[PDB]
């Protein structure tokens, strides 16, 4: 309900409830793992080799056929089992060739239960009795200072939890303008949030047909692994519309020049470097992650006066998201051919 003749100063930067939300999401993330299964018997010598393919001597395939010893239901029986892995999760140990998983020198590892999904659902946050939640209903609000158009609420609106290191997906979008928000724009190391008005579609897929394979580790245990790959050995990717991306960049360049002088040249670059999951944007699609190269987008310039954009991805199985100290996470291989469509909402 609305409230009138009212001036209230807000701040997103000294705001709380992002802190305990960042606590709570990782907390529920760990609550979603204690029923699941460890992979402590799996860290073992791996006889790996190249996948069956017409191999290019100069480029590299990203799938390895790894055979190894594994336990059975019974202790005295050992078995020989193979699977496939990406290049980005095994390393070479030392003639012959023998690999191992990268986490197995330094951390434990947990398979996710294939029951649980990773799609978002809207979380409505609410306050207990004795507190209230306010909301700035102003159109233009850079993120700090007074807001005359406010209204209280009992519960927050729909918030879907995404995970995207750049290019925040499926988020809520602005009313009419394209807005840019920061804490102190003249400070450079503080980021700049870009909430642009119109959503812009993305397609993302892995075109490879994927068979899983169950492996019994021990008594009542289970393990899933990439078995055979039927069809053309292809490469995962994403696409966006060309002219929409051009027009939205025109809108954000129109909005930037208020802050940086009206006669100013603005261009873009790919990100400088660092971890693999900050050089890209890193998302989840159908319960499987993507680290997908973004250099085909931020390569333009701007002057003070049917096609698409395709961009290639990479697929890792084991992660350490939020960069924990000994905690890792395996991701199960999923069937079929996966694609998903998301509305790109903002930029960082």
């Amino acid at each position, epitope marked *: 309900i609305h409230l009138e003749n009212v001036t209230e100063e807000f701040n997103m930067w000294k705001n709380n409830m992002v802190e305990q939300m960042h606590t709570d999401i990782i907390s529920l993330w760990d609550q979603s793992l204690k029923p699941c299964v460890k992979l402590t018997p799996l860290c073992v010598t791996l006889q790996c080799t190249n996948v*069956t*393919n*017409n191999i290019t001597d100069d480029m590299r395939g990203e799938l390895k056929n790894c055979s190894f010893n594994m336990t059975t239901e019974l202790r005295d029986k050992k078995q020989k089992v193979y699977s496939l892995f990406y290049r980005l999760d095994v390393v070479q140990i030392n003639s012959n060739k023998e690999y191992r998983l990268i986490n197995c020198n330094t951390s434990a590892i947990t398979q996710a239960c294939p029951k649980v999904s990773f799609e978002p659902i809207p979380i409505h946050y609410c306050a207990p009795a004795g507190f209230a939640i306010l909301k700035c209903k102003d159109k233009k609000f850079n993120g700090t200072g007074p807001c005359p158009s406010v209204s209280t609420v009992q519960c927050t609106h729909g918030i879907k939890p995404v995970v995207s290191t750049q290019l925040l997906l499926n988020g809520s979008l602005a009313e009419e303008e394209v807005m840019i928000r920061s804490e102190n724009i003249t400070n450079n190391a503080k980021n700049i949030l870009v909430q642009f008005n119109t959503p812009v579609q993305i397609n993302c897929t892995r075109p490879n047909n994927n068979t899983r394979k169950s492996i019994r580790i021990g008594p009542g245990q289970a393990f899933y692994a990439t078995g055979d790959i*039927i069809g*053309d050995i*292809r*490469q995962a990717h994403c696409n966006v519309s060309k002219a929409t991306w051009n027009e939205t960049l025109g809108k954000v360049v129109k909005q930037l020049r208020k802050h940086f002088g009206n006669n100013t040249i603005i261009r873009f670059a790919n990100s400088s470097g660092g971890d693999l999951e900050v050089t890209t944007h890193s998302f989840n699609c159908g319960g499987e992650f993507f680290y997908c190269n973004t250099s085909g987008l931020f390569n333009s310039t701007w002057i003070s006066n049917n096609d698409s954009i395709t961009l290639p991805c990479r697929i890792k199985q084991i992660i350490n998201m939020w960069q924990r100290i000994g905690q890792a996470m395996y991701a199960p291989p999923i069937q079929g051919v996966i694609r998903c469509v998301s509305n790109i909402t903002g930029l960082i």
Partner: antibody
Amino acid sequence: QVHLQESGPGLVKPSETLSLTCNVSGTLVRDNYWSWIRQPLGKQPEWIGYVHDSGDTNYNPSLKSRVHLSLDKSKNLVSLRLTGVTAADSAIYYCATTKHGRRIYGVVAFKEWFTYFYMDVWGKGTSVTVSS
Amino acid sequence: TFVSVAPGQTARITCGEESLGSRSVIWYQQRPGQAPSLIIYNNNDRPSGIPDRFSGSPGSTFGTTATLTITSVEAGDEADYYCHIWDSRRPTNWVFGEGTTLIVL
């Protein structure tokens, strides 16, 4: 209308550097790819490889060294040179053009495609036999 | 490798390795005493001169074997057949497949 005319000795001693030539009919040697095919009696053929100017000169990686394909744009012929004729080398050999084509299955910019080949026309042959 | 049918009937001639990826099958035939002769140069394409009813398996099917369907056969169809498969996954087949002879009654 083309037809090709193979030419060689037919009776070759072992460990002898064999050569064959191939005459043309109408279409000059510049315009199209060129290829050689061998076949033993009662067997499937083995495509020896293809030759064309400007780097289009790949060989069968079976032998890959003791065979040398070439063209004659001055005389408009197709030349093969061989090294070290062995007992299994007794086979009928064929000079023939070929036509390519891009079999494409995905994103072209990701090299997700390849080039097949097919010999549209054929030669007439020369029954090379190795003996002593 | 010998297949006999009545002339004017249908016939299926199979050759080569089972499909792994997308393929480009090529079909030659061989009359006795001649050179080879192309009939089918793509998965289901033919050039001029050769008539129809020389069907081929489509190249998108995964885990099947290259086939050649000849309906309404004739004595002039009496020639050896040759598959030439071009998988996107397997390497270059510098040799052809197996020569199956089609003989007629």
